[PDB]
Design an enzyme around this catalytic site. Structure first.
Site, PDB file in Angstrom:
ATOM      1  N   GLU A   1       0.835  -1.190   0.000  1.00 44.97           N
ATOM      2  CA  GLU A   1       0.000   0.000   0.000  1.00 44.97           C
ATOM      3  C   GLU A   1       0.882   1.256   0.000  1.00 44.97           C
ATOM      4  O   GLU A   1       0.544   2.258  -0.627  1.00 44.97           O
ATOM      5  CB  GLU A   1      -0.930  -0.004   1.208  1.00 44.97           C
ATOM      6  CG  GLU A   1      -2.016   1.036   1.131  1.00 44.97           C
ATOM      7  CD  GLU A   1      -2.435   1.526   2.495  1.00 44.97           C
ATOM      8  OE1 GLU A   1      -1.547   1.655   3.375  1.00 44.97           O
ATOM      9  OE2 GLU A   1      -3.647   1.791   2.682  1.00 44.97           O
TER      10      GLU A   1
ATOM     11  N   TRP B   1      -8.443  -1.582  -0.013  1.00 47.51           N
ATOM     12  CA  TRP B   1      -9.300  -0.576  -0.644  1.00 47.51           C
ATOM     13  C   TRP B   1     -10.434  -1.064  -1.565  1.00 47.51           C
ATOM     14  O   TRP B   1     -11.241  -0.257  -2.015  1.00 47.51           O
ATOM     15  CB  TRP B   1      -8.430   0.414  -1.429  1.00 47.51           C
ATOM     16  CG  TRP B   1      -7.447   1.168  -0.604  1.00 47.51           C
ATOM     17  CD1 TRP B   1      -6.187   0.775  -0.260  1.00 47.51           C
ATOM     18  CD2 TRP B   1      -7.656   2.440   0.013  1.00 47.51           C
ATOM     19  NE1 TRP B   1      -5.597   1.726   0.545  1.00 47.51           N
ATOM     20  CE2 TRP B   1      -6.481   2.760   0.729  1.00 47.51           C
ATOM     21  CE3 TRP B   1      -8.729   3.345   0.033  1.00 47.51           C
ATOM     22  CZ2 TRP B   1      -6.348   3.941   1.457  1.00 47.51           C
ATOM     23  CZ3 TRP B   1      -8.593   4.519   0.758  1.00 47.51           C
ATOM     24  CH2 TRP B   1      -7.412   4.804   1.457  1.00 47.51           C
TER      25      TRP B   1
ATOM     26  N   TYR C   1      -4.428   8.993  -1.185  1.00 44.24           N
ATOM     27  CA  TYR C   1      -3.118   9.509  -0.802  1.00 44.24           C
ATOM     28  C   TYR C   1      -2.108   9.653  -1.934  1.00 44.24           C
ATOM     29  O   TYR C   1      -1.387  10.643  -2.000  1.00 44.24           O
ATOM     30  CB  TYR C   1      -2.536   8.680   0.330  1.00 44.24           C
ATOM     31  CG  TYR C   1      -3.349   8.761   1.596  1.00 44.24           C
ATOM     32  CD1 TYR C   1      -3.370   9.930   2.361  1.00 44.24           C
ATOM     33  CD2 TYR C   1      -4.098   7.668   2.038  1.00 44.24           C
ATOM     34  CE1 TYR C   1      -4.116  10.008   3.545  1.00 44.24           C
ATOM     35  CE2 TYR C   1      -4.849   7.734   3.214  1.00 44.24           C
ATOM     36  CZ  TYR C   1      -4.854   8.908   3.962  1.00 44.24           C
ATOM     37  OH  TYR C   1      -5.614   8.979   5.114  1.00 44.24           O
TER      38      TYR C   1
ATOM     39  N   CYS D   1      -7.502  10.498   6.847  1.00 47.78           N
ATOM     40  CA  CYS D   1      -7.367  10.232   8.266  1.00 47.78           C
ATOM     41  C   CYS D   1      -5.991  10.760   8.632  1.00 47.78           C
ATOM     42  O   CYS D   1      -5.805  11.357   9.694  1.00 47.78           O
ATOM     43  CB  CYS D   1      -7.427   8.731   8.553  1.00 47.78           C
ATOM     44  SG  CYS D   1      -8.996   8.139   9.197  1.00 47.78           S
TER      45      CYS D   1
ATOM     46  N   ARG E   1      -6.133  12.651  12.339  1.00 46.56           N
ATOM     47  CA  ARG E   1      -7.395  13.089  12.944  1.00 46.56           C
ATOM     48  C   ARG E   1      -8.249  12.018  13.659  1.00 46.56           C
ATOM     49  O   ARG E   1      -8.915  12.319  14.653  1.00 46.56           O
ATOM     50  CB  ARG E   1      -8.252  13.822  11.906  1.00 46.56           C
ATOM     51  CG  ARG E   1      -8.541  13.013  10.682  1.00 46.56           C
ATOM     52  CD  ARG E   1      -9.580  13.657   9.805  1.00 46.56           C
ATOM     53  NE  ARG E   1     -10.286  12.635   9.030  1.00 46.56           N
ATOM     54  CZ  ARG E   1     -11.360  11.980   9.462  1.00 46.56           C
ATOM     55  NH1 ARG E   1     -11.891  12.269  10.645  1.00 46.56           N
ATOM     56  NH2 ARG E   1     -11.928  11.060   8.698  1.00 46.56           N
TER      57      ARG E   1
ATOM     58  N   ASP F   1      -8.408   4.256  15.102  1.00 45.43           N
ATOM     59  CA  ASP F   1      -9.088   3.054  15.558  1.00 45.43           C
ATOM     60  C   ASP F   1      -7.909   2.425  16.267  1.00 45.43           C
ATOM     61  O   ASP F   1      -7.051   1.820  15.628  1.00 45.43           O
ATOM     62  CB  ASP F   1      -9.491   2.213  14.342  1.00 45.43           C
ATOM     63  CG  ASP F   1     -10.305   0.979  14.702  1.00 45.43           C
ATOM     64  OD1 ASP F   1     -10.144   0.431  15.814  1.00 45.43           O
ATOM     65  OD2 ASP F   1     -11.097   0.542  13.839  1.00 45.43           O
TER      66      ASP F   1
HETATM   67  O1  LIG Z   1      -5.513   4.521   8.446  1.00 47.25           O
HETATM   68  C1  LIG Z   1      -6.583   4.586   9.057  1.00 47.25           C
HETATM   69  C2  LIG Z   1      -7.874   4.735   8.417  1.00 47.25           C
HETATM   70  C3  LIG Z   1      -9.025   4.778   9.212  1.00 47.25           C
HETATM   71  N1  LIG Z   1      -8.974   4.674  10.512  1.00 47.25           N
HETATM   72  C4  LIG Z   1     -10.270   4.630  11.209  1.00 47.25           C
HETATM   73  C5  LIG Z   1     -10.555   5.741  12.215  1.00 47.25           C
HETATM   74  C6  LIG Z   1     -12.058   5.643  12.408  1.00 47.25           C
HETATM   75  O2  LIG Z   1     -12.261   4.462  13.170  1.00 47.25           O
HETATM   76  C7  LIG Z   1     -12.650   5.460  11.007  1.00 47.25           C
HETATM   77  C8  LIG Z   1     -12.796   6.805  10.291  1.00 47.25           C
HETATM   78  O3  LIG Z   1     -13.874   7.521  10.936  1.00 47.25           O
HETATM   79  P1  LIG Z   1     -14.174   9.018  10.584  1.00 47.25           P
HETATM   80  O4  LIG Z   1     -13.129   9.819  11.242  1.00 47.25           O
HETATM   81  O5  LIG Z   1     -14.181   9.335   9.136  1.00 47.25           O
HETATM   82  O6  LIG Z   1     -15.488   9.338  11.190  1.00 47.25           O
HETATM   83  O7  LIG Z   1     -11.519   4.706  10.365  1.00 47.25           O
HETATM   84  C9  LIG Z   1      -7.806   4.534  11.210  1.00 47.25           C
HETATM   85  O8  LIG Z   1      -7.779   4.445  12.429  1.00 47.25           O
HETATM   86  N2  LIG Z   1      -6.642   4.498  10.463  1.00 47.25           N
END
Ligand SMILES: O=c1ccn([C@H]2C[C@H](O)[C@@H](COP(=O)(O)O)O2)c(=O)[nH]1
Ligand SMILES: O=c1ccn([C@H]2C[C@H](O)[C@@H](COP(=O)(O)O)O2)c(=O)[nH]1
Lengths: 316, 316
Positions: A60, A82, A146, A198, A218, A221
């Site tokens: 990726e 993806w 990205y 993100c 921002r 998870d």
């Molecule tokens: O590289 C990544 C991509 C996504 N998320 C997670 C964060 C959230 O759990 C969800 C995105 O939620 P929103 O911020 O768009 O609401 O995907 C990550 O932690 N890391």
């Protein structure tokens, strides 16, 4: 060990995090604002307390580095991170004639046999992007991912900026540059974006011959996302260090909303019973230097001895 | 007290920071990656260990909030933080016929009588922007400043996005939104920008009725810059909280390159002998609600009892 900062973040969220509702309707425990550093000279931050598929992270990253935005490159390296996005666009177009699959992500996680019809449906899609050169250009290209954000930031005058590429020439000519930022947050596309970045922005930093990188993420998870993310950027820090002929410094991960989905508490609790193993090491092909023309084989990870993987439901 | 995080950052840089060369040729002591939080319910983070001109910070914030990019609004409230930028453009144009003033910022700090000819020259400029409505539109408008970045992000399709404005409607309709980011970093303008955004991006966050804000600042002048910056954003956090009818949370300040210019070590050392005084409180006009139509008088700071100010040379 190296990855203790991760284990700490998780503990913290377990007892300090506050309940918070969200987009996906799976609730979460959350904190706002958090930062951790990994001294990249101590070893590579690929978690040992759980087996994380490094192969997916590098195929990726190289997809990103190439400035590629077509799911096809990924499928070829059997990477499906993806697909869900390409498929989505497809099922909601004219060419698609079949078992509707509306709000599928949920239904798969909720119904037995639908899940089976869905994956066969997806099976064809991946194969069709993999073979129909026109279908691939039509449904395989995500557009705003990205790769394009990093290397083809579309301007108002219709041209394109190789954001990352410029930044790297800058590290060479002005390593002490405080303005070494690469950004993926386009204000004019974000309102119609299915998933606005993100990993919003990151900054490089040079001193004493060592290169460091800080990432502003921002949303995190903590269980399912953070472990992959940490690896992508530490890897990225090693590649850029390689090209610029600099030593590797630290990877500082800054967080906005670092959360734990309620459907993951038993697992993170389990992973927290495990003692960290010594960290793996990263090994880059010395002969090759231009990271933009890097591929799978020029990146080796040695001595990765992790605990078994931990299954976990996904949030929707 | 509230501002102890500031005092800590400074200590840290004093003994941990490493020497680092820079753009201005005044050297610096620097660290990369740092974050601090201020619980805004504990009081307002306007430093007591040194007298900081709050008036300048709010006239500049309201200039930002209005989406104004003309130095004129500032001059009228006797705020000269940006004059140096307008003047600059002017002295390097046709209309200017006078004592050249090339690399003036330096020379002022280096020669006695030049400094005197320069400020009289600037005196006329400010007065001329203040009175010649055409001159003001021509030399008073900086163009790409936080105000336009916040409220008039020019798009590729030639239109404009009220970035902050949209974000606020979002906090109202979806307070739990993880995507509440306002960005000032435009990749296509940054290469020809005299000063690409220092305050690159910031994010809001809502939970339990409290609003919090995290700021990503790429470069920080710990002594001269950070104290003003902290106030601008904490203030901004209070205004947005006011409009959205939410309580005030914390202000998390994240840093990229937080540095101390070598020409400031005696001063920061002195300020560190001082014990923090209890913090001032912020008081907003309850009758008014629309922060966009806010002015000087709707913002009062009570109980600010600071130590005397500390003169310091500027870096160039
Ligand atoms: O590289 C990544 C991509 C996504 N998320 C997670 C964060 C959230 O759990 C969800 C995105 O939620 P929103 O911020 O768009 O609401 O995907 C990550 O932690 N890391
Ligand atoms: O609100 C502000 C504006 C500027 N600076 C300082 C940081 C650096 O000292 C200099 C900008 O240097 P560069 O990052 O552009 O090199 O101005 C601040 O600290 N805060």
């Amino acid at each position: 060990m190296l990855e203790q900062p991760y284990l700490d973040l998780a503990k913290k969220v377990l007892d300090e995090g506050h309940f918070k509702p969200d987009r996906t309707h799976t609730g979460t425990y959350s904190i706002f604002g958090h930062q951790m550093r990994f001294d990249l000279s101590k070893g590579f931050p690929l978690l040992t307390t759980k087996k994380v598929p490094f192969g997916l992270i590098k195929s990726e990253l190289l997809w990103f580095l190439h400035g590629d935005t077509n799911i096809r490159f990924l499928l070829q390296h059997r990477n499906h991170i993806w697909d869900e996005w390409a498929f989505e666009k497809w099922v909601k177009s004219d060419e698609y004639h079949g078992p509707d699959m509306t709000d599928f992500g949920h239904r798969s996680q909720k119904d037995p046999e639908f899940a089976a019809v869905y994956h066969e449906e997806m099976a064809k899609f991946d194969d069709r992007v993999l073979h129909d050169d026109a279908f691939a250009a039509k449904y395989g290209d995500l557009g705003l991912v990205y790769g394009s954000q990093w290397r083809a930031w579309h301007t108002s005058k219709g041209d394109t900026i190789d954001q990352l590429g410029d930044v790297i020439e800058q590290i060479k000519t002005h390593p002490y540059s405080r303005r070494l930022i690469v950004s993926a947050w386009n204000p004019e596309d974000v309102p119609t974006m299915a998933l606005p970045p993100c990993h919003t922005l990151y900054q490089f930093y040079v001193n004493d011959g060592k290169l460091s990188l800080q990432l502003y993420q921002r949303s995190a998870d903590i269980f399912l996302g953070v472990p992959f993310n940490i690896a992508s950027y530490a890897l990225l820090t090693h590649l850029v260090a390689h090209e610029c002929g600099l030593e590797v410094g630290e990877f500082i991960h800054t967080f906005g909303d670092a959360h734990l989905y309620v459907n993951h508490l038993d697992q993170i609790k389990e992973q927290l019973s495990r003692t960290p193993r010594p960290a793996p090491t990263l090994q880059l092909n010395p002969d090759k230097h231009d990271i933009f023309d890097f591929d799978m084989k020029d990146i080796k990870l040695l001595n990765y001895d992790p605990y078994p993987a931990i299954k976990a439901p996904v949030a929707v």
